[PDB]
Design a protein around this nucleic acid. Sequence first.
DNA 1: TCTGCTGGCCCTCGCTGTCAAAATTGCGGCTGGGTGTGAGGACGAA
Length: 48
Amino acid sequence: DLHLQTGYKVERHMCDGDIVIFNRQPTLHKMSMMGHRVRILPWSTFRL
DNA sequence: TCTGCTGGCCCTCGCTGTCAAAATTGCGGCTGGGTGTGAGGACGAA
């Protein structure tokens, strides 16, 4: 049942090079939330 | 035919009673979800 014909959708894991967006309350201005690129690093924190 | 005092009507004012709002996000922990009762069931003793 794992055959992939054209037109399907596959929910892959978030690999490196993906685009995400970071936020910190309070968002006072439009610099306070904006996009980044995903780089996969060890340990358990966001590293910006 | 004029002068001019007056109740009424309108408008205005100042004051007071009520109205709604009061940064963003996240995590952890405790406490409380009504209660008493007229009668349905069972029982110990005789």
